[PDB]
Amino acid sequence: MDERDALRISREIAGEVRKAIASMPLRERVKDVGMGKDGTPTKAADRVAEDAALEILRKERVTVVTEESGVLGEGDVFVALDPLDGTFNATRGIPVYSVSLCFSYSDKLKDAFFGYVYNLATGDEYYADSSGAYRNGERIEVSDAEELYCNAIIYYPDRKFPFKRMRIFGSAATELCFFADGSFDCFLDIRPGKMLRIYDAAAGVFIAEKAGGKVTELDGESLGNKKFDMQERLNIVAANEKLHPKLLELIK
Amino acid sequence: MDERDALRISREIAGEVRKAIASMPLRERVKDVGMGKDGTPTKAADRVAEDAALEILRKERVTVVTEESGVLGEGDVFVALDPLDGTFNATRGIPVYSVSLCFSYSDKLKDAFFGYVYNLATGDEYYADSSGAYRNGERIEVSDAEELYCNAIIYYPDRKFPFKRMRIFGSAATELCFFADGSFDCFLDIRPGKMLRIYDAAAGVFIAEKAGGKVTELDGESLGNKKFDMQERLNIVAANEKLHPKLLELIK
Ligand SMILES: O[C@H]1[C@H](O)[C@@H](O)[C@H](O)[C@@H](O)[C@H]1O
Ligand SMILES: O[C@H]1[C@H](O)[C@@H](O)[C@H](O)[C@@H](O)[C@H]1O
Ligand SMILES: N[C@@H](CC(=O)O)C(=O)O
Ligand SMILES: N[C@@H](CC(=O)O)C(=O)O
Ligand SMILES: N[C@@H](CC(=O)O)C(=O)O
Ligand SMILES: N[C@@H](CC(=O)O)C(=O)O
Ligand SMILES: N[C@@H](CC(=O)O)C(=O)O
Ligand SMILES: N[C@@H](CC(=O)O)C(=O)O
Ligand SMILES: [Mg+2]
Ligand SMILES: [Mg+2]
């Protein structure tokens, strides 16, 4: 499998997940249907999205790490799948939620070769590969802001901060893409509980880095050894390389 | 003018503003074209939205209080207009932004008779009149959550908080409607600067109250005497009546 295969696979999944969600009334979407392998409820919207995606991934030689069904398959290519990132928004009709996929040549983030996040409500397509990062077929890059007085996505502000704007949209994969395309100047997840899982973050991280972003853990450490499994957790500090160290100092 | 006139006028404005914005590429939307009477820049998207709305309101006997052009006309019915609430989102292609209208029989919020907020990206229509509050033609009401451990929209969290979720979407009028329809359990704007203007909040406040919500200033004081002018500022605490007093105690 190469990056072209991954793009093709991702686009087919996006199409099937989009069709499955769009036809589901909010009343149905919001229903709990079971307990996910991640230890949070699987909503009916989560279930239909994952089935749509797994139906396609099942044909490939991959090991899938996915929120609801856990680790599936035995292939050498690892796929971190979030079949519906932003479930709360989807069940409320708030148009920020997406399907997220990151493909790696091992079970570690450093061997990632493809990232894909598709907004299921708007049809916006973000992806990145060896040639760079894209939004709807157009090359993107992070902003060049150097000041802390900037436009920040942050989970969660717990003190007075110097930002120009703070936003929290409820879809980490999509929000990492808002940072990747320069819509926002930085993305932070500094929750002490360390809540982000590998499938929430992996594609967004890969896309943001291809777009020029510097993206690390809380203390500046590389995310390269983050594992494609259900147990992995992440804090994220993401910004261009001039802003990034200021962000690190800010949160000490 | 009564509440049926106001509904008809609002729908006409929504249609015109919607097509004016939808046709404008992001790179055009984001351009500063002048200084607004509110003291913030008018973007091309703001100007185009406002001209569309004013062309319609010009035929009515109203005094309009609007963000970019200020106070216009001499009619006895006052209209607080935010031609595009969530301009930052609109210029970035983030689908949470709306046109907001509150109609009052004086220059005070207590004399409001109609509120209308239309999401320009999704086409969701929120309004309220003597018969109640509506989302896309269906009656809505606030949630009945009684615990602080709830789903909150809050500008801005500056300390550790007990919420289940915190969200900040960048469109106060629309966010007040997310609260009105029960999608979120409360809306708070507790920014010490007191940043909200009458046209940001008036329609959202009126819709939320019609939906059963209790909505007050920071100290629990009524919003009735808030004025339809450019100088007015608001902090907001909005929740059902069981949750509301707990929030008041929380933010001391
Ligand atoms: O998939 C979700 C989503 O990314 C949310 O925005 C984030 O707060 C949660 O931690 C994550 O599980
Ligand atoms: O119209 C805007 C919008 O409602 C934003 O969400 C809010 O943060 C701003 O204060 C307001 O001016
Ligand atoms: N992924 C899209 C196609 C595309 O973005 O080109 C879809 O299948 O709906
Ligand atoms: N969240 C979606 C609702 C849907 O498509 O069912 C939207 O308003 O864009
Ligand atoms: N304002 C809408 C109509 C409606 O809200 O029902 C439009 O003309 O696009
Ligand atoms: N507020 C300005 C500058 C910025 O926030 O980047 C804008 O909307 O473009
Ligand atoms: N501002 C975007 C919102 C969206 O992608 O739906 C637009 O042009 O419609
Ligand atoms: N999924 C949410 C539902 C809600 O907060 O209303 C929960 O854990 O309760
Ligand atoms: Mg998910
Ligand atoms: Mg505005």
Q: Which two tokens stand for residue A194?
A: 């360390």
Question: Cβ–Cβ contacts within 10 Å for residue A9, how many?
Answer: 22
Give the three-state DSSP class for B20. helix
Closest residue by Cα to atom 2, ligand 5, is B15
Residues 6+ apart with CB under 8 A from B182: B140, B141, B142, B143, B211
Q: What angle do CA A135, A140, A144 make, to 5 degrees?
A: 140
Last residue of a domain, one of B102, B117, B138: B138
A50 and A87 fall within a common domain? yes
Last residue of a domain, one of A97, A115, A138: A138
Distances (CA, A) of B30 to A36, A236, B87, B107: 42, 29, 8, 32
B215 and B151 fall within a common domain? yes
Under a CB-based contact definition with an 8 Å cutoff, are residues B51 and B95 in contact?
Answer: no
Hey, is the C-beta of A110 within 8 angstroms of any chain B C-beta? no
Give the three-state DSSP class for A32. strand
Q: Which two tokens stand for residue B10?
A: 């609002």
Under a CB-based contact definition with an 8 Å cutoff, are residues A247 and A186 in contact?
Answer: yes
A167 with B170: Cβ contact below 8 A? yes
A38 and A53 fall within a common domain? yes
- Quote the ligand 6 centre to A85 CA distance (angstroms): 27
Strand order through the sheet with A125-129 = A70-72, A62-66, A77-85, A98-104, A112-119, A125-129, A132-135, A138-139
A71 and A162 fall within a common domain? no
Helix (H) or strand (E) holding A44, with range, is helix A44-57
Under a CB-based contact definition with an 8 Å cutoff, are residues B196 and B174 in contact?
Answer: no
Over the Cα atoms of chain B, what is R_g?
17
B159 with A158: Cβ contact below 8 A? yes
Q: Is B211 annotated as a binding residue?
A: no
B157 and B133 fall within a common domain? no
Q: Select from B124, B158, B169 the Cβ nearest to the Cβ of A159.
A: B158
Query: B198-210 and B172-180 are packed helices; what angle lies between their axes, rounded to 10 degrees?
Result: 10
- Quote the ligand 6 centre to B28 CA distance (angstroms): 14
Q: Select from A94, A158, A166 the Cβ nearest to the Cβ of B168.
A: A166
φ and ψ at residue B9, rounded to 5 degrees:
-65, -45
Distances (CA, A) of B92 to A86, A188, A191, B51: 19, 19, 26, 21
CATH number at residue A120: 3.30.540.10
φ and ψ at residue B6, rounded to 5 degrees:
-55, -40
Which 3-state string (H, E, C) describes A114-154? Answer: EEEEEECCCCCEEEEECCEEEECCEECCCCCCCCCCCEEEE
Omega before B116 cis (within 30°)? Answer: no
Rounded Cα distance, B75 and B78, in Å: 7
Hey, is the C-beta of A195 within 8 angstroms of any chain B C-beta? no
Rounded Cα distance, A194 and A235, in Å: 6
Q: Nearest CA to B176 among B109, B245, B128?
A: B128
Q: What angle do CA A148, A207, B32 make, to 5 degrees?
A: 50
Omega before A116 cis (within 30°)? Answer: no
Rounded Cα distance, B213 and B220, in Å: 13
Q: Is A2 annotated as a binding residue?
A: no
Rounded Cα distance, B88 and B47, in Å: 14
Give the three-state DSSP class for A184. coil
Give start and end residues of each alpha helix (H) in chain B.
Answer: 3-22, 26-29, 44-57, 87-92, 172-180, 198-210, 243-250
CATH number at residue B172: 3.40.190.80
Rounded Cα distance, A88 and A85, in Å: 9
Residues of A in contact with B168 (CB under 8 A): 166-168
B178 with A124: Cβ contact below 8 A? no
Experimental method reported for this structure: X-ray
B74 and B176 fall within a common domain? no
Last residue of a domain, one of A90, A118, A138: A138
Under a CB-based contact definition with an 8 Å cutoff, are residues A203 and A116 in contact?
Answer: yes
Under a CB-based contact definition with an 8 Å cutoff, are residues B193 and B30 in contact?
Answer: no
A158 and A96 fall within a common domain? no
A238 and A146 fall within a common domain? yes
Rounded Cα distance, B13 and B6, in Å: 10
Helix (H) or strand (E) holding A200, with range, is helix A198-210
Residues 6+ apart with CB under 8 A from B129: B3, B4, B6, B7, B113, B114, B210
Rounded Cα distance, A86 and A95, in Å: 9
B133 and B21 fall within a common domain? yes
Rounded Cα distance, B216 and B245, in Å: 10
Q: Select from A156, A167, A183 the Cβ nearest to the Cβ of B157.
A: A156
Distances (CA, A) of B154 to A45, A127, B176, B237: 27, 31, 11, 9
Rounded Cα distance, A223 and A122, in Å: 30
Tell me how close the Cα of A13 comes to any Cα of chain B, in angstroms.
Answer: 23
Question: Which contacts of A36-45 are long-range, i.e. CB under 8 A and separated by 24 or more positions?
Answer: A36/A67, A36/A68, A36/A69, A37/A67, A37/A68, A37/A69, A37/A70, A37/A71, A37/A230, A38/A67, A38/A68, A38/A70, A38/A197, A38/A230, A40/A67, A42/A67, A42/A68, A43/A87, A43/A91, A45/A21, A45/A84, A45/A87, A45/A90, A45/A91
Rounded Cα distance, A28 and B145, in Å: 21
Rounded Cα distance, B146 and B163, in Å: 12
Give the three-state DSSP class for A167. strand
A156 and A201 fall within a common domain? yes
Tally of domains within chain A: 2
B16 and B132 fall within a common domain? yes
> A13: domain range?
1-138
A1 and A108 fall within a common domain? yes
Rounded Cα distance, A116 and A174, in Å: 10
Rounded Cα distance, A50 and A64, in Å: 11
Under a CB-based contact definition with an 8 Å cutoff, are residues A243 and A181 in contact?
Answer: no
Under a CB-based contact definition with an 8 Å cutoff, are residues A185 and A215 in contact?
Answer: no
A95 with B121: Cβ contact below 8 A? yes
Q: Nearest CA to B140 among B177, B85, B96?
A: B177
